[PDB]
Amino acid sequence: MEVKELERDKNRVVLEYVFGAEEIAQAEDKAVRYLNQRVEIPGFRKGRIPKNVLKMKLGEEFQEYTLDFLMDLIPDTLKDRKLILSPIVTERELKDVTARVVVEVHEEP
16 A cells, blocks of 8 residues: 655645555455345355456446445554544545557558
């Protein structure tokens, strides 16, 4: 986990938390755990839906749950600071793994 201070404006501080691959996987696992306590779908025993199935059914909504659990890492990083309020979330973002290759081809004239 890497936190960067974006700005300080008096006692108002903006912090950007960037989460690593391990934390993301841990958060995805909490999301599976959370969902399996609360939803039952045809074809799977109560509490036994595989992670892959949840990601497929839920699609882009699965990320929202993943981000919810990532958010839960934050308070502990601030327990050494004296703050009036709980942190206010002003932005969230998750980008799945991605890959790109650029090639050049020469068509027969």
